[PDB]
Design an enzyme around this catalytic site. Structure first.
Site, PDB file in Angstrom:
ATOM      1  N   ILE A 177       0.802  -1.221   0.000  1.00 50.52           N
ATOM      2  CA  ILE A 177       0.000   0.000   0.000  1.00 50.52           C
ATOM      3  C   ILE A 177       0.835   1.270   0.000  1.00 50.52           C
ATOM      4  CG2 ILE A 177      -1.692  -1.227   1.398  1.00 50.52           C
ATOM      5  CD1 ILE A 177      -0.864   0.629   3.720  1.00 50.52           C
ATOM      6  N   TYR A 178       2.157   1.163   0.109  1.00 52.84           N
ATOM      7  CA  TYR A 178       2.993   2.308   0.439  1.00 52.84           C
ATOM      8  C   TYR A 178       3.424   3.126  -0.768  1.00 52.84           C
ATOM      9  CZ  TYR A 178       3.410   0.491   5.173  1.00 52.84           C
ATOM     10  OH  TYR A 178       3.149   0.043   6.445  1.00 52.84           O
ATOM     11  N   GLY A 179       3.020   2.747  -1.966  1.00 55.02           N
ATOM     12  CA  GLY A 179       3.385   3.490  -3.149  1.00 55.02           C
ATOM     13  C   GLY A 179       3.629   2.546  -4.305  1.00 55.02           C
TER      14      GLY A 179
END
Ligand code: F43
Ligand SMILES: C[C@@H](OP(=O)(O)O)[C@H](NC(=O)/C=C\CCCCSSCCS(=O)(=O)O)C(=O)O
Ligand SMILES: C[C@@H](OP(=O)(O)O)[C@H](NC(=O)CCCCCCS)C(=O)O
Ligand SMILES: O=S(=O)(O)CCS
Lengths: 550, 259, 442, 442, 50
Positions: free
Chosen positions: D365-367
């Site tokens: 989900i972090y990029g």
């Protein structure tokens, strides 16, 4: 066997720390924690009153929390326990003030300004005139307007944390100055440290401006430098009355607020686009200099571990936790480095091994000493995790184990050699040895910088080479991933704690952050985080006097 | 030609890692779980419906003439345009027969066209649904790679790889997707890997005894076989680290004389 | 040809050089001299060997007031400095018939390295020069003095300085005339980075040559920014020719006519010359007299006004012998001209706006620095497209040592390095010669 | 000249082209084709005429989801594409015979313009092309459709989207392969800012040609960054020759030997070939019988490992026909190679770490996102100096349509415009020809 | 200033399309209501997994 982390495991876990079995699903869920129940009651009241029925906190959706025992957290070298929720940077005012004090600090040198005043402007500069200027800047920095009642000013109670301080390496000028707003190097540092810092600084005078916290709350970190420069210029043209022309005033303005300005952090480029005085621009040496444990402690391990705790709480919790990701954040990632004495025990073992084998600083940095020290420390830490099941339960994530063992190995190597790059090389060797030992490491990618590190530790290429003191969150390998930077700062500090150095990268930052007027005292960051987790920390930046009581 | 040696070391854990890495090594068969049971445990589809399709079959769609691309034979699920699904496992640190990095290396050296992701708490494989089900049932489930007590298939809320086992020698699970039954001694799965309950619990078999687990695990432990007892692995790791450092400093033969 | 404009070229002494020169002969896209100066600016790097030695000896790595205890290297860079230069040239060398000029400055304490053009033909930007020079210097220092493997990071910090963390060269001892492309005010702003003091020091405080240098750089940058494209190309070419290269001898003529005059007299002479040359005509006579003026040639009128602006700056700053008058001179020259003729000023008010920027940047406590550090890559001085900066060079050339930001204080190394090139020391003469060499191709 | 190692040359079909070719023949500093590609990539601009017409017709100026009611222009750019192209060519032309071309693409729906090289010689960077094309387009649109003086601002907003306020071309209809200089994460990273999708679309989804394009760009960038100078140059030369141009037919040979194999089989083939060629030798035999290997040629071993990595990525992502296996394959090829031989990875672990971050940001989900949106300028994939991106391009070429952010979704205008030039579309066959041209000059 | 600073608008149409065509998950107004209930708990900082 006696271990430093044993007492915390006894307090946290009901069973024996060496016991391999327990029972679950019998704690009632989130009701086992007082913090969660307080959150539930607060959520109900807040929804009903302020949110007009819009739900805010629903523990019933998502994971059923509390299937296992939610452990409390000790704080290393402190005899107080707190829940994990109290260590979240949003729920902890101590961490917020830790970042606020660093954000609102700008150091400006006043020797070019004095020389320009004396020669070009034809105005005499005396200690009495310096005292007058200090009075003017102390009144004017928070919100003041000198001899101008018609001008709008900030409420004085709204900026009670704003100060303007002065320090100098000139002893006679130091004792001729007012002690109300002077940072005395002689009485704040030990004799040898004070001598070293005075020699490094020279015979120059510097002023430290602490912009009020509210300014950094409302605005960003790049506001601090402009606020400081504007107030310094106003105070300089008010105290010293100059009948010269306005071009000369421009030269004086450059000399006074744009010649010897020292910032805490630099601006970041590309996708990390940020202004100065943001946590991603603070180099590891600068953060090591911010923490003041070399002043009050002679133990190198404690000096390195205080920097480890501060770097964890800043980089992992605030910077990477919110500035770069946001959400719940990475509290348990950083707390594993400063909650129990696990890292303390590992670092003390590393120091003992280095002292027994190589001496305190008895070897030049070679590859063989790096390999053997890092391997021994890593093996010790991993077998400590192996034979204490409660320890493995406490550090449930592999990232909150790899980082701790690698930090211990790097601190040991830095003790042995005194070189920070050798310490980071030992860190990387420890990481890969951990991976082969437990067939495990941190998260997905996580070890991007640990597979790239060995090659980049002693590299000489443009974007790969830097001393560990000059590295920081903007270093390309360290830009994204959690669990490294706070320990990198501690390794950089340990590189100098082995030599008994008074500072690491900047003497001026070290002297400036020794100021007793700071709200967050950087001498004991762990103790202050413990105080904040107990709701006993008085933070600044609160707009209580401009808000209704109802 | 060249005969591979897979891993270094002379200890039992090193030998087990070599066996897992070796594609010519026949994994010992321990269970017999039917394909329908495995499919319903994974929870991606119900046994009985056709496979959903993410892109038309490779025959129907047309591609440019790529010599270097068309001489690699694709998987059967690839030419059918099947969707890519996952199977994910959590391996306990207490003598689980398979470990995350060991699992990833064995999968990448044994299976064709799979995506393996290793982590502390879990290990995940992604492949075409038909091939995924086939190799999962054939290798991942009814072999020594799976222990119903110390390894459980969890798609979310993975927590318990590092926690102490319960009174039944069984891994912690917040969602409690698999359950140990006392009056048979078998382990039954009551939910899919995501956590959706199943219509009928599926029996996966008896847990592996601890004594057998000791001699088939691929993890180094102080209580089990330790890395100090296998100096060759540590020496190889240190050599790799030194080679990386020297190559990073200056990549020349003269610099590597100090290897 | 597409422009029928002809110009007569005069040297810095006011003597005629050539007549009926096509206007495009001085264009940046045609003039060989401007091309050569751009290439040399791109590929030239200055190295401070004495600075490297001092930083390494004291462990002064890290920037303003930064110093790392224990990371000190005692090497003799200035003593060797021929060995180091030879090794750097050998590393940077691409072929045998290759430029790769590394030359000793001030008897060993500085190096002037020219990266070969072969390494820049396959580079998308000019930053390859500094990075290649830094890498070659690091290798040469590590090889000449047997630096340990664990001090290469210290050597890198001494040479480049905080680069991976701070995307620039802050505490380093390697410098170039162009800054980092990520630190530009806008796209194409790379060439407007040379300050006035650097231009004055390179030309050795010669008024006309400094004006020519600043004007050439500014107008080449405008060509790079896409501004001098289509309908604006003629105006920028005329501005360059009449403000920098003293076309038709307008600047010298105005200065001679106003030796004892003021800004108003310069405005009067400019209007008289514009009327006599047919550049402006009478629009209409109002009821209260004041015959309005309209330009018969808009671009030529702008060029005449720019030349008069330079002449007015020269006259005022030679009367005062101080360089603090530039902002007021430009501002009120434009104001007086506008409300005297009813005509627009230089750059249609952009010159006046940039003069206001100069005023508030160099005349108050919210002022900062002096006129010597003016450049087009600043938020305050970017607004005029190469029409307000060249006069500041004349102003700083006329200064009789009453400025804190004097060229000697801020551009000594720059002058020592770039004064060796003939096209940089006398930009006016060599630009004129290059224009003469391509007269017949138009 | 200074490198005595020769290489063979094979085409994309595995057929021999020439033998005993010197290593420097494929160097960016010597190969004419690489120089031509770098020169042409700086001056070629893609124009979306249909996008301009649609934006102006609906007032879609502003960017994402932005409309300005009242600022609507009804023009017929696609119908008058020939006239617009002629006007742009007239504006951008320098004299007569420069390399200025504006070709019509998709029946006037797109424009491919090439600003003259003379406009880039006197330019410090590559941004002159886009700005000049934007100005030429604005003038052509203003003078073709008699647009009111109060609507040129709307036209400018249609062509470039927010440029003065946002230092980029985000909402505009003009594009180039290289990104804006303000988006660079490090100095010298201009050539690293080409996304994988752009390279795949430019080469029309040809695996070997995409590998060649990506490798040439990455290694030319490493030359630009100063990384490939001195003792580091041979490593990057061999990496480009073997991983990118299959010098000894290594890539095709490994893929052929592992048509129905796994990553481990590719690793075994690579080690067997390295032993047979003498690149690696047995260092020592351990007590357990493990045969620790040492490189007889460090850089040659690096090149062999990189070629094997490309082959392994091709094999795995052709077996799966999905481009989501790239990070895992790159990680575990090195992971098994290192512990099978005791030798360092492809880039001494720098490519493996790039894979450990690629696996982070391609499955979380972090990029990040799909593999096609990554590039050498990306903060996640900047760590390997030209040894990790060509495998990503090959895998994206092998994809069958399982990615949402496919090259069609991301690079439609850029791919269609840049596929029209043979040098960009088939870089392999022209780089080989360029090397053959200078074969005899070393 | 705080309200403007803390406001971000996200188009939840591409995510729905990916859920529909890649993961084979059907999106209905009931599912959107459940998602809204979840995100109103998660955005302030509540725990949903792990
Ligand atoms: C969904 C993700 C994907 C991702 O990008 N982040 C997740 C979830 C995320 C969310 C948790 C949201 C919530 O509370 O429900 C956040 C807080 C990031 C955020 N700002 O939203 C987070 N993780 Ni994660 N995450 C953590 C950790 C971990 C460890 C857990 C170890 C194990 O027991 O398996 C593993 C990594 C692993 O692969 O091993 C992990 C994974 C994962 N982590 C996987 C899968 C979780 C799963 O259980 O289904 N976290 C930890 O190791 C402890 C620190 C902890 C972080 C919060 C804190 O410090 O309190 C948290 C940090
Ligand atoms: C770029 C900077 O200008 P500088 O570079 O000259 O400091 C620019 N303006 C400044 O000069 C700085 C601050 C704003 C001060 C203006 C106050 S208006 S009230 C004083 C009127 S008087 O002092 O001129 O009489 C800014 O930062 O906004
Ligand atoms: C990679 C990049 O993400 P983007 O794809 O550019 O959006 C980058 N993220 C990060 O750095 C994440 C760091 C914090 C979260 C992970 C900590 S392990 C960023 O926000 O600019
Ligand atoms: O495990 S993941 O890499 O998905 C994220 C860790 S919080």
């Amino acid at each position: 066997e006696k271990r430093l982390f044993l007492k915390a495991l006894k307090e946290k876990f009901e069973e024996d720390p060496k016991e391999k079995y327990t029972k679950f699903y019998t704690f009632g869920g989130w009701e086992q924690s007082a913090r969660k129940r307080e959150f539930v009651e607060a959520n109900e009241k807040i929804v009903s009153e302020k949110r007009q029925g819009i739900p805010l906190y629903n523990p019933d959706i998502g994971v059923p929390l509390g299937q296992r025992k939610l452990m409390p957290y000790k704080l290393s070298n402190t005899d107080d326990y707190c829940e994990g929720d109290d260590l979240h940077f949003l729920n902890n005012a101590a961490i917020q003030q830790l970042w606020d004090d660093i954000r609102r600090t700008v150091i400006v040198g006043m020797d070019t300004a004095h020389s320009v005043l004396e020669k070009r402007l034809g105005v005499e500069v005396t200690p009495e005139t310096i005292n007058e200027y200090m009075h003017t800047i102390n009144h004017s920095l928070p919100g003041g307007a000198v001899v101008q009642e018609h001008m709008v000013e900030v409420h004085p109670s709204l900026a009670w944390d704003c100060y303007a301080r002065i320090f100098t390496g000139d002893d006679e000028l130091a004792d001729e100055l007012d002690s109300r707003f002077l940072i005395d190097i002689n009485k704040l540092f030990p004799e040898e440290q004070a001598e070293t810092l005075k020699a490094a600084i020279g015979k120059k005078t510097y002023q430290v401006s602490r912009v009020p916290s509210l300014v950094g709350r409302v605005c960003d970190g790049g506001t601090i430098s402009r606020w400081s420069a504007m107030q310094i210029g106003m105070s300089f043209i008010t105290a010293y009355k100059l009948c010269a022309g306005e071009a000369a005033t421009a030269d004086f303005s450059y000399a006074s607020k744009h010649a010897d300005v020292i910032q805490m952090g630099n601006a970041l480029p590309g996708r990390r686009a940020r202004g100065p005085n943001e946590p991603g621009g603070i180099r590891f040496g600068i953060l090591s200099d911010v923490v003041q444990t070399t002043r009050v402690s002679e133990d190198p391990v404690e000096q390195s571990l205080e920097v480890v705790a501060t770097g964890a709480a800043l980089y992992d919790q605030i910077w990477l936790g919110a500035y770069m990701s946001g959400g719940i954040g990475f509290t348990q990632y950083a707390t594993a480095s400063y909650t129990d004495d696990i890292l303390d025990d590992f670092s003390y073992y590393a120091l003992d091994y280095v002292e027994k084998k190589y001496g305190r600083m008895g070897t030049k940095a070679t590859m063989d000493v790096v390999e053997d020290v890092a391997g021994e420390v890593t093996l010790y830490a991993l077998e400590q995790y192996d034979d204490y099941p409660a320890l493995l339960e406490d550090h449930f994530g592999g990232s909150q184990r790899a980082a701790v063992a690698a930090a211990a190995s790097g601190i040991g190597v830095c003790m042995a050699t005194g070189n920070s790059n050798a310490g980071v090389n030992g860190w990387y060797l420890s990481q890969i040895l951990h991976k082969e030992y437990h067939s495990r490491l941190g998260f997905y990618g996580y070890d991007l910088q640990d597979q790239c590190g060995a090659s980049n530790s002693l590299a000489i290429r443009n974007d790969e080479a830097a001393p560990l003191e000059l590295r920081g969150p903007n270093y390309p390998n360290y830009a994204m991933n959690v669990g490294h930077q706070g320990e990198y700062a501690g390794i950089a500090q340990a590189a100098h704690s082995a030599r008994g150095d008074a500072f690491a990268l900047n003497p001026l930052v070290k002297v400036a952050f020794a100021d007793p007027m700071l709200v967050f005292d950087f001498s004991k960051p762990r103790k202050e985080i413990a105080r904040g987790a107990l709701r006993e920390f008085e933070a600044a930046g609160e707009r209580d006097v401009i808000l209704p009581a109802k | 030609a060249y005969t591979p040696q897979f891993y270094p070391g002379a200890t039992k854990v090193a030998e087990n890692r070599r066996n897992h890495l070796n594609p010519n090594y026949e994994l010992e068969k321990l269970r017999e779980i039917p394909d329908e049971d495995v499919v319903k445990i994974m929870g991606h589809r119900q046994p009985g419906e056709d496979y959903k399709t993410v892109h038309p079959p490779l025959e129907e769609m047309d591609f440019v003439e790529d010599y270097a691309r068309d001489l690699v034979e694709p998987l059967n699920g690839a030419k059918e345009g099947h969707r890519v699904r996952y199977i994910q496992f959590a391996d306990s640190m207490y003598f689980a027969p398979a470990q995350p990095y060991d699992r990833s290396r064995s999968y990448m050296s044994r299976l064709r066209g799979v995506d393996a992701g290793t982590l502390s708490g879990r290990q995940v494989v992604e492949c075409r649904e038909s091939d995924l089900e086939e190799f999962s049932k054939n290798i991942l489930m009814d072999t020594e790679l799976f222990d119903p007590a110390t390894s459980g298939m969890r798609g979310a809320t993975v927590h318990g790889h590092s926690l102490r086992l319960d009174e039944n020698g069984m891994m912690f699970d917040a969602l409690q997707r698999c359950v140990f039954d006392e009056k048979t001694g078998h382990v039954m799965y009551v939910k899919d890997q995501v956590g959706k309950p199943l219509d009928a619990p599926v029996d996966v078999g008896e847990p592996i005894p601890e004594a057998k687990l000791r001699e088939i695990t691929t993890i180094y432990r102080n209580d089990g076989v330790a890395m100090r007892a296998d100096p060759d692995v540590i020496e190889v790791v240190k050599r790799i680290h030194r080679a990386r450092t020297l190559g990073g400093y200056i990549p020349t033969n003269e610099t590597f004389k100090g290897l | 040809v597409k422009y029928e404009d002809k110009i007569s070229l005069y040297d810095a002494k006011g003597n005629l050089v050539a007549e009926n020169v096509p206007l495009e002969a001085i264009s940046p896209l045609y003039n060989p001299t401007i091309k050569s100066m751009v290439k040399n600016i791109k590929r030239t790097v200055a190295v401070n060997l004495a600075g490297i030695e001092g930083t390494l000896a004291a462990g002064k790595i890290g920037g303003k007031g930064c110093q790392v205890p224990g990371r000190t290297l005692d090497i003799s860079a200035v003593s060797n400095a021929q060995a180091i230069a030879d090794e750097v040239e050998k590393i940077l060398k691409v072929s045998e018939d290759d430029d790769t000029a590394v030359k000793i400055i001030n008897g060993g304490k500085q190096l002037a390295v020219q990266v070969p053009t072969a390494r820049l033909e396959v580079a998308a930007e000019y930053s390859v020069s500094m990075l290649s020079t830094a890498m070659a210097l690091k290798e040469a220092l590590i090889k000449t003095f047997n630096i340990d493997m664990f001090d290469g990071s210290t050597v890198h910090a001494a040479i480049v300085g905080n680069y991976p963390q701070v995307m620039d060269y802050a505490g380093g001892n390697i410098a170039s005339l162009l800054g980092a492309p990520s630190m530009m005010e806008g796209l194409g702003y790379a060439l407007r980075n040379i300050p006035v003091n650097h231009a004055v020091a390179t030309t050795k405080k010669n008024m006309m040559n400094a004006i020519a240098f600043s004007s050439v750089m500014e107008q080449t940058a405008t060509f790079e920014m896409g501004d001098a494209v289509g309908s604006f190309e003629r105006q920028h070419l005329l501005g360059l020719a009449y403000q920098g290269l003293n076309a038709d001898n307008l600047v010298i003529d105005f200065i001679k006519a106003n030796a004892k005059g003021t800004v108003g007299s310069v405005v009067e002479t400019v209007i008289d010359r514009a009327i006599a040359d047919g550049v402006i005509v009478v629009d209409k006579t109002m009821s209260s007299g004041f015959n309005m003026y309209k330009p018969a040639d808009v671009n030529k009128w702008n060029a005449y006004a720019a030349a008069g602006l330079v002449a007015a700056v020269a006259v005022s700053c030679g009367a005062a012998r101080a360089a603090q008058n530039v902002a007021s001179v430009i501002l009120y020259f434009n104001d007086i001209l506008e409300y005297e003729t009813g005509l627009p000023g230089v750059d249609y008010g952009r010159s006046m706006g940039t003069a206001v920027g100069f005023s508030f940047f160099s005349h108050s406590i919210y002022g900062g620095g002096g006129p010597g550090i003016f450049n087009g890559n600043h938020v305050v001085t970017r607004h005029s497209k190469g029409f307000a900066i060249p006069p500041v060079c004349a102003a700083m050339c006329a200064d009789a040592g009453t400025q804190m930001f004097s060229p000697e204080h801020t551009s000594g190394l720059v002058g020592s390095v770039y004064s060796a090139f003939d096209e940089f020391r006398e930009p006016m003469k060599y630009v004129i010669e290059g224009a003469l060499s391509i007269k017949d191709q138009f």
